[PDB]
Design a protein around this ligand. Structure first.
Ligand SMILES: Nc1ncnc2c1ncn2[C@@H]1O[C@H](COP(=O)(O)OP(=O)(O)O)[C@@H](O)[C@H]1O
Ligand SMILES: Nc1ncnc2c1ncn2[C@@H]1O[C@H](COP(=O)(O)OP(=O)(O)O)[C@@H](O)[C@H]1O
Ligand SMILES: [Mg+2]
Ligand SMILES: [Mg+2]
Lengths: 525, 540, 106, 98, 49
């Protein structure tokens, strides 16, 4: 390198080019995949990451772990991005994507080292991915009976499979039934904001409950609140967006009087405005009053005198859930409080839940929303329970969209690898090596399951390969029985779209990583 | 064994993946589990000395030097300045036990430590930690079922409260208030029973006011079926005692009205000034007259008042109290049976609260005056007034009485009880051991480890009382097996008998169930963590 | 000119054009002596809002009347180059009459 | 912005509300729909009223989107919805589209 | 006009799932309760509502 009097780029620019650059990219991808390797399958383990603030997070979810690691390697960030994509589109399988992509790169690393043109590898990946996705769509098992009990069983099995990798796997049947009921209660869009999740410290996991209605925490009651009754057997709920307080009429409103009786009239007029609002609310027939805006102490005492319930500063999401469950409308004005705009629930009650007070709206028959109340011994315990429930909810929603399932435990990927190897045996031979490498890389998931559970991976892989070659589609890893078993009759079911998206994203990430030849880093500003 | 990986590429080019990867750290595999188990063992061994009647307290100092001598496990763990994440998990477990139950905050930590020690031994023998967690969960289910089997029911009726007194006494035995043991237990039981929705519903804790004032003696602590107020009468010449007071609760300051909206009253002539002055005077006179018209004897205000109103109240034989806080206003209204009136125009006779006696109390040579409102007809709110020789025993008595109130609340929620002193733990260990015999071999080790971890509580109790742990626990277990009696425990107080039913050592069943459940779940979560990624920065 | 019409509905090309070079501010302006508005009802507020733009609308209407008097057909057109700003209301009013206007000229 | 009372009375009359924050998007919507951006709350006259075959709220992936959709294969403005697994990949596809 | 073609990037499903829409797509949410119209009559206001 001859030092030119005037340099081309800025001083401090770092450039890496050639085969070593791509080899380093592959190595970094395997480094990232190692950080989430052991969080796979029922015998997976959780990871603990402490940020700069010292607040640790404990998670089994691959996407969460990858997000918490502050990856700065440009090629390694592709794995994090595809994990995020898998989480967004599917919600489950955020670990399999990273393992599959890294395994593809590892399998093609020896061919890169010997100067193979990366376009050939990219073409082979595209062909193999298309064939695998077509095979998944072809062999996926679906039932064209539209039986309600069969659909319930399918969803429960899918939720159990999605849940059988987390700390709540011991209560997986309980939580799966809860999640299936919650997803059924949603009407048509399966909006996540219609499934509230409340975490209350203290209590066993089995103490968690699903309320067919809405529940939210008590919100800074004023004086005179304890004088209000706390149980109603057929209340009508007035959902409001109104500030029931004594206040200025407007921010820019100014009152100019020049006589004492005018002063008294103005004071009485403010009081009469507040009492007019309260009287309209009372004569609307409602017994429970909820407001997004604050409700003052005067209104609280007024409602206490009428044996009514008030709760101000209710969060907007909780008001939306209450409106969906009870069937009213959030009124910003109280001038027309008719019967059609008032919510109605069978029972309203405030109860003690683990050192906190919660308002319960139960008995809603037309409820299109639900609330989870999760109990646990720690903040991170309940957070990870929420993450597991989110995985299950996304799985059940996608299965509602289409009831196509493939047996889990690596059975589907062993079948795909067998099919891809059979295809690759019948091509000229330059693409044969790469497609065979793709098929071999497809074996990572069962191998990782066997490694995490403490098996001998090689023997189980040989048995799986022989079983698939000799006939048998849904034979996967049996963790408890130390052997292999038909994972379809074992009800290890996952939606086909999970594996479809996993393969697509992993292939795209591998192709993008391989397609790069030079990395240039400008000096930081 | 830190920072993760370091290769700098096979070709010598820089290999940077994680930001600040040269300053971070990570622990993997069985080594991280061993470190976590060591941390939990340290925390549990520190906590285990404060278990039982013979348990000792911990003197805790905060950042600013404030000293809190306490025996409450949750409080101790909350005031510890720990840095290990597993220690924080143990603190969270104790706080969760405090929230759900309020009693047994020290048993959960000891049980979790014992469970993790047995898990360490099993891991050294070469078992997957998930298998250990599954065995622990199965044994916990068996133990919970056995606890349900061997429980007993008690009456939660007001006419006969002896079982409630015994349960509160058992709760308070380990605290410093055991000198006034029966008095404290009785006042706690009465407080809980007074403020409670009888039909098995919740016990509302903002209806119990707990205040402590220095001086006097712990025996002077009493239950007031009313409200104690830190305020006093506004005028120095007002009478210090009112009999058969008809309270008038008001939330309007005894001042001329003021509109909330931005307002300007224009004075344009001398006649306007005269009218304004007369209006102010008439406002004061008419508010006093409206208060007096209802026949009230005592007027309680929240926002205070000014000199003219004060002297008019004194002149009209109306004792008054000002600047009473909102919660105290609500408590007074609830106890006296009156309603809260927002302005004098709405004040009527039917909204007046009735108090048999309102008095001002002096506290020695301190200038401090506090107001007693009691002798209400059907007071639905109660207050506990605690005295002591120093503020520290006052705080300890506060938390001990809170424990007793929580225990009686648990009894109200569920009246099934089991007998303490380690009898329940010994019976659960026996049931787990019997179950493990019929169970297949692989998880038999985990179930036996769970039983051994359960046996720590009788061992800790016997060691704290000076007896030999292993000898006493083995003798009690053999006696329990020989004759069917799950009530035999550790004679901590040396009363001559091992039968805790005769000794009246009573525990809430849901408390023990919550202890076992929370310990099992926390131990499972700790066992499932096999990787730590700390920043390792050690910032200033 | 290095600026164009600021309203999307303005014609992009006028064949025969009358050029009106003006230095008159067609945007809203504030009273020099701290005017301030006082009203006691929403209807009064709406009336005051509608009546506060009469000064600008008068000059806009003068321009409109001149255009309608000069070119009664659609063959010709007006281009108004103003050295001062033109608020969106005046731009809309002029565009409704098929007049292209430019503001903030040098 | 949308006032609370305005949102109330719009909900009462079953009127869909969309709040386009950027004026470029407002202009593009006016072009693709055929409406005129009214500077006041006056009711739109017949010519100024915009028309579209279907407007609805939908979720693509995990993003909430509002879709102004024409059934006819024609219009002033057409949009391309690019899916992908990485942001960089979609940026590259967008450059190719450009 | 080049600017009449709009590109909306939504993550998740691979580029093979891309499609063209005769209209516009905004990554936003509705303010009110109505979320679907079949015979839209859009009225556009440049002023606050
Ligand atoms: N009961 C089971 N037996 C065997 N394998 C299972 C079982 N449940 C799940 N698996 C497998 O574990 C793999 C990982 O699933 P999981 O860890 O829950 O989420 P992710 O796919 O994000 O890692 C899946 O591919 C699935 O096939
Ligand atoms: N009089 C007693 N005799 C024997 N054991 C007792 C007695 N009182 C309490 N214990 C035991 O001491 C243990 C610890 O109780 P304590 O220290 O009061 O609260 P915590 O359960 O939070 O440690 C309980 O499990 C109980 O069985
Ligand atoms: Mg999963
Ligand atoms: Mg205790």
């Amino acid at each position: 390198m001859m030092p030119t009097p005037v340099i081309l780029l800025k001083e401090g620019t770092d450039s890496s080019q050639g085969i070593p650059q791509l080899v380093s990219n592959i190595s970094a991808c395997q480094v990232i995949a190692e950080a989430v390797r052991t969080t796979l399958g029922p015998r997976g383990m959780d990871k603990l990451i402490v940020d700069g603030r010292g607040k640790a997070t404990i998670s089994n979810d691959g996407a969460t772990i990858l997000k918490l690691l502050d990856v700065v390697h440009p090629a390694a960030k592709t794995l994090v991005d595809i994990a995020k994509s898998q989480d967004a589109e599917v919600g489950d399988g955020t670990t399999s994507v990273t393992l599959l992509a890294a395994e593809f790169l590892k399998q093609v690393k020896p061919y890169v080292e010997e100067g193979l043109h990366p376009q050939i590898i990219i073409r082979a990946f595209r062909t193999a991915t298309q064939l695998a996705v077509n095979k998944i769509k072809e062999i996926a098992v679906t039932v064209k009976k539209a039986d309600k009990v069969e659909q319930r069983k399918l969803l429960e099995k899918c939720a159990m499979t999605a849940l059988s990798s987390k700390l709540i796997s011991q209560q997986k049947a309980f939580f799966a039934k809860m999640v299936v009921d919650a997803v059924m209660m949603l009407d048509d869009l399966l909006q996540l904001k219609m499934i509230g999740i409340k975490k209350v410290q203290g209590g066993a996991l089995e103490d968690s409950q699903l309320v067919a209605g809405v529940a939210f925490k008590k919100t800074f009651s004023y004086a005179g609140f304890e004088m209000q009754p706390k149980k109603y057997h057929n209340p009508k709920i007035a959902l409001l967006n109104v500030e029931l307080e004594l206040k200025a009429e407007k921010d820019n409103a100014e009152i100019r009087v020049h006589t004492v009786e005018d002063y008294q009239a103005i004071v009485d007029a403010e009081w009469n405005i507040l009492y007019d609002k309260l009287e309209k609310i009372h004569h609307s027939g409602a017994k429970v009053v909820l407001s997004k805006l604050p409700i003052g102490d005067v209104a609280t005492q007024y409602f206490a005198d009428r044996d009514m319930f008030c709760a101000g500063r209710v969060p907007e999401e909780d008001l939306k859930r209450t409106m969906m469950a009870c069937g009213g409308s959030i009124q910003t004005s109280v001038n027309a409080l008719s019967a059609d705009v008032l919510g109605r629930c069978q029972v309203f009650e405030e109860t003690q839940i683990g050192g906190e007070r919660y308002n319960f709206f139960t008995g809603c028959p037309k409820a299109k929303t639900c609330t989870f109340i999760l109990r646990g011994g720690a903040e991170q315990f309940m957070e990870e329970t929420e993450r597991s429930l989110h995985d299950a909810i996304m799985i059940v929603r996608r299965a509602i969209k289409n009831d196509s399932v493939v047996a889990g435990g690596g059975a589907i990927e062993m079948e795909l690898s067998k099919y891809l190897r059979d295809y690759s045996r019948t091509i000229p031979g330059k693409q044969q090596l790469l497609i065979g490498a793709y098929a071999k890389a497809l074996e990572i998931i069962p191998r990782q399951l066997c490694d995490n559970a403490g098996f001998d991976a090689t023997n189980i892989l040989n048995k799986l390969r022989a079983r698939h070659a000799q006939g048998g589609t849904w034979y996967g890893v049996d963790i408890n029985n130390e052997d292999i078993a038909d994972n379809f009759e074992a009800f290890v079911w996952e939606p086909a779209m999970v594996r479809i998206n996993a393969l697509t994203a992993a292939s795209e990430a591998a192709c993008l990583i391989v397609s790069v030849d030079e990395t240039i880093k400008n000096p930081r500003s | 064994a830190s920072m993760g990986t370091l290769a700098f590429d096979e070709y010598g080019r820089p290999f940077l993946i994680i930001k600040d990867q040269d300053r971070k750290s990570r622990l993997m595999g069985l080594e991280a589990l061993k470190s976590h188990i060591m941390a939990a063992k340290a925390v549990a061994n520190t906590m285990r000395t404060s278990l039982g009647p013979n348990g000792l307290d911990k003197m805790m100092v905060d950042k600013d030097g404030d000293v809190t001598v306490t025996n409450d496990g949750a409080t101790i763990l909350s005031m510890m300045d720990v840095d290990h994440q597993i220690a924080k998990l143990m603190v969270e477990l104790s706080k969760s036990q405090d929230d759900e139950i309020g009693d047994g905050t020290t048993g959960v930590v000891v049980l979790a430590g014992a469970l993790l020690e047995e898990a360490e031994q099993l891991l050294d023998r070469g078992i997957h930690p998930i298998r250990i967690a599954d065995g622990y969960e199965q044994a916990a289910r068996v133990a919970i079922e056995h606890l349900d089997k061997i429980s007993d029911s008690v009456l939660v009726d007001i006419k006969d409260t002896e079982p409630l007194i015994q349960t509160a006494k058992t709760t308070l035995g380990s605290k410093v208030v055991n000198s006034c043991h029966r008095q404290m237990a009785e006042i706690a039981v009465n407080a809980v029973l007074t403020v409670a929705d009888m039909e098995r519903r919740d016990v509302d804790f903002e209806l119990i006011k707990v205040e402590g004032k220095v001086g006097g003696r712990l025996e002077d602590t009493k239950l007031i079926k009313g409200v104690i107020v830190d305020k006093d009468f506004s005028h120095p010449q007002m009478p210090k005692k009112v009999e058969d007071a008809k309270i008038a609760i008001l939330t309007c300051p005894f001042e001329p009205p003021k509109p909330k909206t931005k307002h300007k009253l224009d004075v344009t002539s001398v006649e306007d000034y005269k009218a304004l002055q007369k209006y102010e005077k008439e406002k004061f006179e008419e508010m006093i007259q409206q208060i007096k018209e209802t026949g009230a004897n005592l007027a309680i205000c929240q926002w205070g008042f000014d000199d003219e109103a004060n002297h008019l109240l004194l002149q009209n034989n109306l004792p008054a109290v000002r600047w009473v806080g909102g919660p105290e206003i609500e408590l007074i209204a609830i106890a006296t049976g009156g309603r809260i009136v927002p302005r004098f125009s709405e004040l009527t006779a039917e909204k007046l609260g009735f108090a048999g006696l309102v008095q001002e109390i002096s506290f020695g040579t301190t200038k401090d005056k506090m107001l007693v409102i009691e002798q209400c007809k059907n007071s639905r709110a109660v207050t506990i007034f605690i005295r002591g020789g120093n503020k520290m025993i006052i705080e300890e008595a506060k938390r001990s009485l809170h424990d007793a109130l929580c225990v009686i609340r648990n009894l109200i929620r569920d009246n099934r009880v089991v007998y303490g002193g380690g009898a329940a733990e010994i019976s659960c260990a026996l049931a787990v051991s019997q179950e493990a015999d019929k169970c297949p071999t692989l998880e038999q080790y985990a179930m036996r480890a769970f039983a051994d971890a359960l046996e720590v509580i009788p061992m800790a109790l016997s060691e704290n009382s000076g007896m030999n742990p292993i000898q006493t626990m083995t003798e009690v277990r053999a006696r329990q097996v020989k004759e069917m009696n799950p009530a035999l425990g550790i004679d901590c107080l040396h009363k001559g008998t091992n039968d805790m039913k005769q000794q009246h050592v009573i525990e809430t069943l849901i408390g023990k169930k919550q202890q076992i459940s929370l310990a099992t779940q926390m131990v499972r979560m700790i066992l499932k963590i096999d990787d730590i990624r700390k920043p390792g920065e050690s910032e200033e | 000119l290095d600026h164009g019409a600021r309203h999307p509905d303005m014609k992009k090309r006028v064949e025969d054009a009358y050029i009106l070079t003006c230095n008159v501010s067609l945007e809203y302006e504030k009273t020099e002596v701290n005017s301030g508005f006082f009203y006691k009802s929403a209807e009064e507020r709406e009336k005051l809002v509608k009546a506060e733009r009469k000064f600008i609308e008068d000059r806009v209407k003068k321009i409109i009347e001149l255009k309608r008097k000069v070119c009664g057909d659609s063959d010709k057109g007006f281009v108004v180059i103003n050295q001062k700003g033109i608020d969106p209301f005046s731009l809309d009013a002029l565009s409704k009459e098929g007049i292209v206007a430019l503001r903030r000229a040098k | 912005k949308v006032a609370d009372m305005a949102l109330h009375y719009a909900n009462k009359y079953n009127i869909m509300l969309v709040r386009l924050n950027s004026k470029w998007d407002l202009r593009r919507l006016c072009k693709t729909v055929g409406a005129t951006a009214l500077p006041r709350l006056t009711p739109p006259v017949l010519e100024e009223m915009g028309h579209c075959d279907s407007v609805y709220l939908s979720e693509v992936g995990d993003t909430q989107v509002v879709v102004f959709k024409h059934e006819k294969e024609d219009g002033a403005i057409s949009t391309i919805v690019l899916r992908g697994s990485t942001d960089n990949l979609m940026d590259d596809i967008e450059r190719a589209v450009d | 006009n080049v600017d009449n073609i709009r590109v909306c990037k939504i993550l998740g499903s691979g580029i093979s799932s891309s499609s063209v829409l005769h209209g516009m797509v905004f990554k936003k949410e509705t303010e009110g309760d109505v979320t679907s119209v079949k015979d839209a009559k859009i009225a556009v206001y440049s002023c606050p509502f």
